[PDB]
């Protein structure tokens, strides 16, 4: 139906500026701590801890099959990788800063992508 390619084009139109707002985002982790899963093999009891690990590459997967709907799909995978990091390691550790300073950086992002997302409708 035409109305089926319509919302197709919507959904393709958001893929395109979620695709922008992870790659500000992710311009906020310069270290690249966030870059790709906790590895297993390197932190074997991380799933005990961790119930739900997220990381950049594993959205970046899900944005390219156009799997976030909408922009509060996006910002739920943004948050774990924060709050996942900010578990796991304490408070004293470059692992915890770079997550604050991720989520106070990409605070600001975030804010004008919503603004976009419901004026762009």
Do not use: W
């Not at 961790?50 to 156009?66: C, N, S, W, Y």
């Not at 470059?94 to 300073?101: G, I, K, N, P």
């Not at 975030?110 to 976009?116: I, P, S």
């Amino acid at each position: 139906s035409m109305e089926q390619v319509a919302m197709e084009l919507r959904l393709t139109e958001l893929t395109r500026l979620l695709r922008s707002v992870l790659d500000q985002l992710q311009d906020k982790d310069p270290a690249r701590i966030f870059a790709q899963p906790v590895s297993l093999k390197e932190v074997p009891d991380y799933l005990d801890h961790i119930k739900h690990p997220m990381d950049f590459a594993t959205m970046r997967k899900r944005l390219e099959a156009q799997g976030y709907k909408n922009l509060h799909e996006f910002e739920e995978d943004f948050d774990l990788i924060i709050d996942n990091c900010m578990k796991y390691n304490a408070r004293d550790t470059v692992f915890y800063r770079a997550a604050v300073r991720l989520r106070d950086q990409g605070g600001v992002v975030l804010r004008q992508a919503r603004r976009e997302v419901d004026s762009i409708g």
